[model samples]
Target: VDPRTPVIVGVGQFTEGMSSVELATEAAKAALHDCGADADTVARAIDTVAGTRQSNYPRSVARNIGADPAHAVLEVIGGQSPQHLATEFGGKIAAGENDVVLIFGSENTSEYTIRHGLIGAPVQYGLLENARRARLGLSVADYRLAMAELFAPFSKVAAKNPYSSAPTERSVEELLTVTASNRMIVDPYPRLMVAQVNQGAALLMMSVESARKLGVPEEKWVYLRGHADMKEPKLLERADIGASPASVTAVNEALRVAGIGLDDVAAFDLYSCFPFPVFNICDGTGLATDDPRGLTLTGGLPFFGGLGNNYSMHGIAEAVNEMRDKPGQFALVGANGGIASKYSVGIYSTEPADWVADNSAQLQAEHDAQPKVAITEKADGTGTIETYTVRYDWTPHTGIIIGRLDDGSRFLAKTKDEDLVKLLSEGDPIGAKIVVTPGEKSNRAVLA
Candidate 1:
């Protein structure tokens, strides 16, 4: 019997840039068409796994298309959602539970400016309402604030990336050229970086062997390959900011299933939401910063359009396209959600992936064997700044820093106070010296 092969028969994306209702619909239809399936067929796919930066509730994007994704998830919010979702859909197809999978994402942040003729409108009341009114163990604000601490210093990271949406290419001093002249969005981080209004959408169709008999061909077919998903301890519980063990383990599982290792893989795309995530994963995989392949297939969230949840969906599409150009080459895609809270990795190639191993069995082993390290909340320790970010809007900015202790442990703290903000705005804080004292409320570590 021919081994079952899961391939991508269709791929479609829309780079609308803003005002994206039409963008989302058209991209979904184009992907279906690429698969030789029509809108009606897509409507029938039931398992419409859509991804978005915004929630589906008040926006009701799912209802807008009249498509109900069996596993519609808004995700914890970040550039990593799309790549992680592709792995999610792939696993569902492998189980014989779903024949067709549609994965898509779109965001029109620019539309906010165009529609309201304003650039700096704070997030809408409705969206905040959802997070504030939730009855879960943690409110939505708790989640947002956590993610904010991780993402706030976005400009600091984007400044180095040429393709970043807010790409500044600022030198260490130019970056710190903070003064009354520079506008503060968050206390320490400047306004030019962080999340920007970007718009784009992409989708791919994944199907198993049974669907192939329906007339899918070799050229149109891109294999599902391998995938894995796992969440780190809750945001508050996570112990480190310098690296993510969750990322390390997930990539190992993906390579294991693909029957390949980091050495065999050719191209790569590591999540670039912040600089540390890419560095952290490379440390685990034995790959180095100098590796010829480099990282990020989509230029990264800063340079590329962070199409909400589907940011990595575009990366996956790019990987498959590149594979077609260079046969037998491998590529790895990774995504980070929340504050490095959720991790998912996928290994791909046109080389036809191996059959799914005992996925659940391997996952269980990974979970069972992984080391457990406590996330920081010590209320005491001697460490200095690791990576710091300030929330920059158009007004008085807010600042938070993820610091590492002498022991290499990390914690988040407010750094927008007058003296600290001046220091962060004036220089690279990653290696700077600072005094740490316990606070009453945050009572965690503080940078002097």
Candidate 2:
């Protein structure tokens, strides 16, 4: 093993309704303190301080956390941001670019909603899901099953978690039931099925050789054996919305780099902001939807709190703690961004090993070269339904559809037509012929 290989010495997770800066600082301090060092001493030993996108300013977080590193970086927006940053810095540390570094992030979504008077994550995420459902020819009910299978297990796990924000384990029946308390926020997704916006923060202390010099106990250290990051093709360009090649590729690459198979990993945490991403990973990896091992570390995004782009940081912290308790066991944590757009993964263990750089760029480029479906923004002809979704905001319903024109070009459309909406809601619309009318904003489709 390379002596300069990176390892996480300390990890901290803070869940509270505070400002982002305060949350980040508190988590950072906890991490430094966890390793038996003062914040100032750890801060001074750090050469780089990389922060996730939730904080207003990256440098400000470092300053507030008492870290005065030579390099400060603020990562891009994505739920995958935390793991992506770790992979980036892991390579740097492995290459001897820097010695010790600190990475931290936090979110105050509850306060932000209170101040801004906005709905929860469901509405915003549902709107996007509705679009994808139409494009992929996936029925609202089909997506619901995917969500339930993906998240119900996590909710059950969260209920058992002491640190969970909403620690009430729910049965699959209860999660799927539509009632006043569990109203359908979006078609197929009840309010309980989606993630809740909340506050959280997490920090990690990493070093090449400082932990030994600082007298940190070996039990407190967790090594990042394999890491990878990749983004899928754009929404409209994807051949199949149900498929996430990038996510599957990233996980495969990380496991390959770690020189281990999925079965070799003792623990797993697939990002669960929505169940579809988890479903995507499970399907792509050939894992059963009901894997007995279960998926999640901090309950899940909904039960533990989404925490904006920083939820996976908490997953990392929890994995570290679990690894410490069971030394030599490996844990795999997957982080996703956007609508299954970006994916990052880490294979971790207390067992020491040399860091291996991920070889994902070539795979990503090959994925990017895959053929994309042609899209026609305007359509005035007969077409066949692809994927579709129905949306209800507690009143009238609307049907959104994506269809392939007779010429084989894709087009997006919507209809409030009661009969058409019923046909879509009650029956499978996929491959069914429909008449389409061109509009200024979008196309309109009706059963032929």
Candidate 3:
């Protein structure tokens, strides 16, 4: 093994009711200061893998914190971004091309809502915005929030999870309570259960051989064991959101790179942005439902905090502290982005290793093993409602429906059901069966 060591000397987070730009800068400065370093030094010394969704960019943060403008970097959008970015950057540090690294992210959605009332949800920019692309595929229906149904299943999994952000301490039936009248935050996801009213940031610093010469302490260091990255085409292209094979591959590849298995992990922090990710991973990985390792360290994306890319960073930061007491235990971090399209993953440990490798091999292996499938192309007009939602505030209600075919396949659809109001107020419609027909416009999905 190479005798050099790496330590996380700095960590920081920023969350004020509003002020995203300021909060991001605070996190950046604190992380650098934690290592007894400054932004200018960090700017010159390290590489960055930042996560700033289009509407909210964070690269301005580096300059805001007095760091070199050019040194700052950004990763594509997704909840899974931070871990993947960390792993990839860690590899860069190990290569001796980079030195001290700083990772920072935050969100001011609460403030945004307060300033501009949350009457109509804003439109997503980028891939969801282009018309021709939207025509090719990508629309409100394409981004349907079937993810709500997966939550009841996830809440069942979260009951044992102490760190869950929305730990209502409710059983399966209480959680499944729903109505068409006075329903909460769309359907399926009540306001209390959804990942909202949160604003936080997290940062981690990594150092390598060159970093030691600058007087970095070795005892404080932990190695980046293994990490991987993968992505599904888009929501419209996914074969089934209920069963995400890509997630399973990310976990499997991370374990394989470390030469370990599920049993090797002493603790875990699965991405729990919604219930689907947790339930899907559990179903895919063979991790026991009651496995004491605990599903999340940050309560998950909804309960703990969902500050854009910062959520998993919080999980990784906690894993670092947890490993301090136990030492040599593996912690796996999974990340998902943009309706589960983008992914980046990493495995962290205090254990010694003889070599450092890309670890993307396992990700590639899993991708090769199970290729992405497109199911929205053609159908026989039959599906059982896995979960459905009614998005309304004051006017113009719309239905977001996800279904599993009689043949056992899943797809997303949308409808302007005027009765959606009645459906949300009185009936439990998650498991009902419905007929679907190709829409007049490719942008729409007609449900009957």
User: How far is 235's C-alpha from truth in model 1 (Å)?
Assistant: 5.2
Query: Which sections of candidate 2 miss by over 4 Å?
Result: 109-146, 196-198
Tens-place lDDT digits, model 2, residues 297-372: 7778777766548888888888888888989988999998886779999988988888876788888888888898
What's the CA RMSD for each of the models? 10.2, 4.3, 8.3
Q: Which ten residues in a row have the lowest lDDT in candidate 2?
A: 111-120
Which one is best on lDDT? Answer: 2
Candidate 2 matches the true fold with a TM-score of 0.90
Report lDDT (Cα) of residue 323, candidate 2: 88
What digit string (tens of lDDT, one per residue) describes model 1 on residues 184-213?
444333332233444445565556563454
What TM-score, to 2 decimals, does candidate 1 have?
0.67
lDDT of each: 0.55, 0.75, 0.56
Model 3 agreement with the true structure over 193-263: per-residue lDDT tens digits? 45443344546555555445544454445666766677665444455434556667777777777888889
Cα error, residue 13 of model 2, in Å, equals 0.7
Better of 2 and 3 by lDDT: 2
